[PDB]
């Protein structure tokens, strides 16, 4: 059974099965392709097929650059191969993931940082093209190697930054799980707190804050919740503007800056597919 | 288009239409 990956420069330990063919999953190692993603038994197989290879990032449209930061947009129907790589790849480190064969009716943003060798994988999310219930995230992942740096939260902002464009209001798919509910409860408290910062108003509707984050209303008022800014004073429901939160929100999104760990809306080069 | 859960003990149903005051520290 499949314990480590080799990928790129990096071993990674995997987390849980993921249901590659039984020839390869008897193995302990499994060597893969930094750009394509096709899966190999040795490092000897590897180095013949670095050789040949002529992919040096995802495939699909570059969507999103900020230097070497990159986004790639990939449909499911047109580059099928690399996506179902990408989803055997993701069910190594995602539990609750149950999508692999079937990824035509999916787009994936494939998330790369540039070095000299080549766009180098972070992490994706997925997406349903015609989603009933308006989820704008199917999946989610950030690689073992880039956890707990930022980028998550980025691919989080990326996908509202898709569905501000879109005139949509998003949600992520049911259900989320611990690492996802955390990582989305942080990014709603930033988002909720800079809208309220720069917000003059003496007043405000769930729906006007949902229309420009394209947070969806539920998760507004679950975040308004969690924060304790909902209160009650003789009939009415109340934004509390929290002093506390808002200071260490400013001291937080200065370190935030400092890092360069943000997506910037003016280097997203995208009209939506179909 | 409503919302509930409880704030200090209480079950309150919330419009996401309405508009809603927003309060500093205060009394
Ligand atoms: C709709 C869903 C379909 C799916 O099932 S998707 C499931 C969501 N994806 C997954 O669960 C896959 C596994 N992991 C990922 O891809 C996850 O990393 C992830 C994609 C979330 C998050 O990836 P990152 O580690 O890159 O996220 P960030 O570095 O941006 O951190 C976000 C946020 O979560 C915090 N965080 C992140 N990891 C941890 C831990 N470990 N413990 C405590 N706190 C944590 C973190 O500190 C942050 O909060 P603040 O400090 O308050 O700003
Ligand atoms: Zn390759």
Request: aromatic share 12%; proline share 4%.
């Amino acid at each position: 059974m499949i314990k480590t990956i080799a990928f790129g420069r990096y071993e990674l330990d995997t987390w849980y099965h993921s249901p590659y063919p039984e020839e390869y999953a008897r193995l302990g190692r499994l060597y893969m392709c930094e750009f394509c993603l096709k899966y190999m038994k040795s490092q000897t197989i590897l180095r013949r097929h670095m050789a040949k290879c002529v992919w040096k990032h995802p495939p699909g449209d570059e969507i999103y650059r900020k230097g070497s930061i990159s986004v790639f947009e990939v449909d499911g129907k047109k580059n099928k191969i690399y996506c179902q790589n990408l989803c055997l790849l993701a069910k190594l480190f995602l539990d609750h993931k149950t999508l692999y064969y079937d990824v035509e009716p999916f787009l994936f943003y494939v998330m790369t940082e540039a070095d000299n060798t080549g766009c180098h994988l972070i992490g994706y999310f997925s997406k349903e093209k015609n989603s009933f219930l308006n989820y704008n995230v199917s999946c989610i992942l950030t690689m073992p190697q880039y956890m707990r740096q930022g980028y998550g939260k980025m691919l989080i902002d990326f996908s509202y930054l898709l569905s501000k464009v879109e005139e949509k209001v998003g949600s992520p798919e049911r259900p989320l799980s611990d690492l996802g509910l955390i990582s989305y409860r942080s990014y709603w408290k930033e988002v909720l707190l800079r809208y309220l910062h720069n917000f003059q108003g003496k007043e405000i509707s769930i729906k006007e804050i949902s229309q420009e984050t394209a947070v969806n209303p539920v998760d507004i008022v679950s975040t308004l919740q969690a924060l304790q800014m909902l209160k009650y004073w003789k009939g009415k429901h109340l934004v509390l503007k929290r002093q506390d939160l808002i200071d260490e929100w400013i001291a937080k999104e200065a370190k935030r800056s400092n890092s360069n760990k943000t997506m910037d809306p003016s280097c997203l080069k995208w009209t939506p597919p179909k | 288009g409503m919302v509930e859960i409880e704030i200090e003990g209480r079950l309150h149903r919330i419009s996401i239409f309405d508009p809603l005051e927003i309060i500093l520290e205060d009394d």
